[PDB]
Design a protein around this ligand. Structure first.
Ligand SMILES: Fc1ccc([C@@H]2CCNC[C@H]2COc2ccc3c(c2)OCO3)cc1
Ligand SMILES: [Mg+2]
Lengths: 339, 57, 623
């Protein structure tokens, strides 16, 4: 039939892609990195505890100044903190209690958040009057908002449980591009350093590389055996890491078009909730449902350290742009800055 | 059903026809990136309390 | 002892409570006394579009009460030629062509019945329902309705709520006292039946049936029945709060005064007839009409009392032979023969005979054997003496027929037949109803033992008290009427000031914002938690609470909550919340509508939250 041919040629193209990928697999990253010294033991202390949320924390995002951060909570608020003094700059109660994500505009002028309301709300931080007010409610997804990241003050990418991501024009309130392809809830996204590309991780156990301008999917990356809950780009933009419900993180190279490494331990059986790289890319920090953040050697795959300071799930984390600190957020309602 | 399967065929066509580099090149570039920025990474190369805003800067 | 209204935030709970019951409609609120009073205040003082509609409504309501046709001829003219009429005829929503044509048609012909303007009332109300009502619901006059309604629905009377005075009656099961309600100062009769005695003589079913019948009859403000406002009880007493009648019964007074003339009888018969008509219109047969059951007030006006033997015939006409023996109709004496209200028209004749002669017409020579009195009723016709006038004779011949088929009051028009007797040809029944006729016997002030009937080993089980658990009652119409005629206006004025002062003060202190607003808060209000009294805010995923002087710093997530159950603590119903960690959370509410609503909303909240959180990968618990 017609569906007979399409289906068998699509499976034939998949073998072709797999064949081409294997043709590139001439050496591994672990072989290539055998001669560089181990990282040794990464031991950080808690420098700040950020106290204030009255319930579980679901997300956090650092400011580009490496000082202010926004966090979102089960208590139905965003709090913006000064990590240096621990003082709250703003505490923003939300219209929906079911918030799940937040984001800080690179300029520092806006934050965004959303969740089960299926809306990405934008909050103007520096109102002409002086207040913090909701400046735009981006409606359009037909499922929960899982992640959102600003490109500038008038563009944001969002991911959703409706299995799509989208680019928005904030002024018009309209989706400029819709990114369709995932066959499961999209759980996380990460913008490439240039913001021409981004990657998403879904409950279909795959990650995808999207062209923001053209709006198409360029590459699809498989390997994980369960939900990808978290994704992050390597600092130079040519690879990214994912963290999954299968208790592994993995490194994927965009130009070799395949997985380079797996970060796992037989000890570690719980899911990963958050991933982030250190400034140089050498450390991969991942947050776990066993209350820890494990620090991996991105090049050699050994675990370099543990940040063990929360009494429930580490639900989110982020390294500052200046490299100075990691923030971990938790179901215990605290954020801690480690250094 | 039939529109969907053609849609998937054309996507896989796009994905299949791209230029790939050897994992040895890819891996070498990542390693080289890390070595170049190793000393500018404070979580790797711990800074003096003086330079640390969470201690004594 | 005075009434303290709840704070206006009580509206959060009360509006949901009332709305779940369908009690927030135009008809349901407008037809309540305090509802009408708060709605008219809103329309008269806070909404121009509605003001003249309500002004006119009230003019028509004053017109309806005008007693004489001359008054109504004068007033209908004034109303049609009035400024409000010209407002309502010259505006955006005027009266219809046919409504104005109908009224103007009757008006031009000088037929001015009490319901001349009923087409106008109906059109007014069709315009008050819709946007004007919804605007009332939004206003703070509905908030005040919620505050009063909260108080109504949390009435738990005890004896300490009454200042009880002298005894004004005595019977087999208890006594009646003059008393004053402390809330409002309203004077009432308190009939305290003794529970030990009730089980002794086995008259619980009589005590229970009196309550049911009183509630069936105690609406509509009948001037000729002793009606109930409240029923309550204490460990050993059943108590009815009733219309105060401190003038003794017609048994005492008949015996004191001796027999009454036809003229004096005609006063009592008229007032009794209107009392019966009331009950019969609510499908209640009284069954025990006799002079001991006719009370007098301070002025000599009479009311029917003691509904314990009465019966509802709206669904099942009775058959049992119930009553006092000189006064029971043929169809009642015959078991198996079902009867209805016809039973009372026979007992009236018997009783009206007694007032004249001094004995029931079937109790010849004071014959005390009950079988004698029964067969007399059934077998023979009564020979009414030559003393009696032809009109009194046609009356009693009519009322004492053995055939319901040929008996006065039973030919398909009821009281309107007994009212038409030539015996009552002098009476204006409107004047009777309005109690305008001079009574025959003004009782001597402060007389003793004027309402007495002819007449430690026992323990009350918890099974006995289970008979009385649905005994307490409050007749809404009665309590709202009592409050309106006493404390409503002044309490409303005091509360307005007390809330104004709290607003100003909250302005200065900086705390202006309502934490409940602009969010997805479901409901809020005070409760006590285990005891600290906190203000609570329920949201879809959590319950937060605060003290005074700060926004909430503590909460309980819906995913933590395993069950919400009712629980007794020191004779107070509490909510016991079971929390995930084998932990407990107990809540105490300040009123019963709150307990009910808080239990409902928490159950809905946590069930629905836990349902949802489970479909959300980032939010749910994983292995
Ligand atoms: F428990 C009992 C007390 C008294 C009796 C009385 C027995 C004699 N005949 C009339 C009976 C009702 O007496 C009254 C008197 C004043 C009232 C009243 C009823 O209701 C409003 O104010 C019956 C039962
Ligand atoms: Mg019978």
């Amino acid at each position: 039939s017609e569906l007979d041919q399409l289906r068998q040629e699509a499976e034939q193209l998949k073998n072709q892609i797999r064949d081409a990928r294997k043709a590139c697999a001439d050496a591994t990253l672990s072989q290539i990195t055998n001669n560089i010294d181990p990282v040794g033991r990464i031991q950080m202390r808690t420098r700040r505890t950020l106290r204030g949320h009255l319930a579980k924390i679901y997300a956090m995002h650092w400011g580009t100044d490496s000082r202010l951060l926004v966090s979102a909570s089960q208590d139905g608020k965003l709090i913006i903190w000064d990590s240096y003094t621990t003082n709250k700059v703003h505490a923003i109660p939300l219209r929906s209690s079911w918030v799940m994500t937040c984001a800080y505009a690179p300029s520092g002028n806006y934050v965004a958040c959303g969740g089960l309301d299926n809306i990405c709300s934008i909050y103007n931080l520096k109102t002409r009057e002086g207040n913090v007010r909701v400046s735009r409610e981006l409606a359009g997804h037909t499922g929960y908002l899982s992640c959102c990241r600003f490109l500038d003050d008038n563009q944001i990418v969002t991911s959703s449980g409706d299995t799509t991501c989208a680019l928005w024009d904030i002024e018009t309130g309209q989706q400029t591009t819709t990114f369709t392809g995932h066959t499961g809830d999209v759980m996380s996204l990460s913008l490439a350093p240039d913001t021409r590309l981004f990657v998403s991780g879904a409950c279909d156990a795959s990650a995808k590389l999207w062209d923001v301008r053209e709006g198409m999917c360029r590459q699809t990356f498989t390997g994980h055996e369960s939900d990808i809950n978290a994704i992050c780009f390597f600092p130079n933009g040519n690879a990214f890491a994912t963290g999954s419900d299968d208790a592994t993180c993995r490194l994927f190279d965009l130009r070799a078009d395949q997985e380079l490494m797996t970060y796992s331990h037989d000890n570690i059986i719980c899911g990963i909730t958050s991933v982030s790289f250190s400034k140089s890319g050498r450390l991969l920090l991942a947050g776990y449902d066993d209350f820890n953040c494990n620090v991996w050697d991105a090049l050699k795959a050994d675990r370099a350290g543990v940040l063990a300071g929360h009494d429930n799930r580490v639900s989110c984390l982020g390294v500052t742009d200046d490299g100075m600190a990691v923030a971990t957020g938790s179901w215990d309602s605290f954020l801690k800055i480690w250094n | 059903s039939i529109a969907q399967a053609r849609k998937l065929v054309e996507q896989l066509k796009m994905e299949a026809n791209i230029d790939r580099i050897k994992v040895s090149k890819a891996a070498a570039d990542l390693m080289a990136y890390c070595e170049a920025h190793a000393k500018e990474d404070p979580l790797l190369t711990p800074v003096p309390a003086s330079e640390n805003p969470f201690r004594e800067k | 002892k005075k009434i303290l209204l709840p704070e206006p935030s009580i509206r959060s709970v009360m509006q949901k409570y009332l709305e779940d019951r369908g009690e927030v409609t135009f008809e349901k609120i407008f037809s309540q006394k305090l509802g009408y009073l708060l709605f008219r205040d809103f329309c008269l003082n806070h909404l121009e579009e509605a003001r003249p509609l309500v002004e006119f409504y009230e003019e028509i309501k004053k017109y309806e009460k005008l007693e004489t046709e001359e008054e109504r001829v004068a007033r209908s003219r004034e109303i049609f030629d009035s400024y409000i009429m010209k407002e309502l005829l010259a505006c955006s929503h005027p009266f219809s062509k046919s409504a104005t044509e109908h009224v103007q048609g009757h008006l031009g012909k000088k037929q001015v019945p009490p319901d001349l303007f009923q087409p106008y009332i109906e059109e007014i109300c069709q315009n008050l329902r819709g946007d004007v009502f919804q605007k009332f619901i939004e206003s703070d006059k509905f908030t005040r309705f919620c505050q009063w309604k909260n108080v109504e629905l949390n009435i738990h009377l005890t004896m300490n709520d009454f200042s009880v005075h002298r005894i004004i009656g005595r019977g087999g099961f208890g006594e009646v006292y003059g008393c004053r309600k402390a809330d409002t100062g309203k004077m009432y009769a308190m009939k305290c039946l003794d529970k030990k005695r009730i089980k002794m003589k086995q008259g619980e079913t009589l005590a229970l049936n009196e309550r049911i019948m009183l509630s069936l009859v105690s609406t509509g403000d009948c001037p000729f029945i002793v009606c109930m406002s409240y029923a309550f009880h204490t460990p050993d007493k059943l108590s009815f709060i009733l219309d105060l009648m401190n003038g003794g019964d017609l048994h005492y007074h008949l015996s004191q005064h001796g027999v009454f003339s036809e003229a004096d009888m005609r006063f009592y018969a008229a007032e009794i007839i209107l009392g019966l008509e009331h009950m019969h219109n609510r499908f209640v047969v009284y069954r025990d009409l006799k002079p001991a059951n006719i009370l007098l007030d301070e002025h000599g006006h009479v009311r029917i009392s003691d509904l314990g033997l009465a019966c509802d015939f709206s669904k099942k006409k009775p058959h049992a032979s119930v009553g006092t023996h000189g006064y029971m109709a043929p169809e009642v004496l015959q078991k198996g023969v079902a009867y209805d209200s016809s039973a009372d028209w026979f007992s009236l004749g018997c009783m009206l005979f007694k007032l004249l002669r001094g004995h029931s017409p079937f109790r010849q020579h004071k014959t005390k054997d009950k079988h004698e009195i029964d067969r007399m009723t059934l077998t023979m016709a009564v020979e009414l003496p030559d003393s009696f006038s032809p009109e009194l004779r046609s009356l009693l011949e009519g009322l004492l027929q053995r055939d319901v088929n040929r008996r006065l009051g039973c030919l398909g028009r009821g009281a309107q037949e007994v009212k038409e007797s030539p015996f009552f040809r002098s009476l204006d029944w409107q004047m009777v109803f309005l109690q305008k006729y001079p009574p025959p016997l003004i009782p001597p002030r402060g007389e003793v033992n004027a309402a007495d009937a002819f007449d430690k080993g026992i323990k009350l089980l918890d099974s006995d008290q289970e008979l009385y658990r649905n005994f307490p009652l409050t007749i809404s119409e009665r309590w709202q009427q009592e409050v309106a005629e006493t404390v409503f206006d002044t309490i409303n004025a005091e509360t307005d000031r007390l809330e104004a002062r709290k607003k100003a003060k909250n302005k200065q202190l900086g705390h202006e914002e309502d934490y409940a607003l602009g969010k997805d808060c479901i409901m809020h209000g005070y409760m006590s938690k285990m005891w600290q009294r906190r203000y609570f805010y329920l949201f879809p995923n959590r319950l937060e609470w605060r003290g005074e002087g700060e926004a909430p710093q503590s909460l309980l997530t819906m995913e933590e909550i395993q069950s919400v159950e009712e629980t007794q603590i020191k004779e107070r119903k509490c909510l016991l919340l079971k929390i995930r960690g084998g932990k407990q959370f107990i809540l105490q509410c300040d009123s019963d509508p709150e307990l009910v609503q808080w239990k409902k909303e928490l159950r809905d909240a946590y069930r629905e939250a836990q349902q949802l959180v489970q479909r959300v990968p980032k939010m749910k618990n994983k292995p």
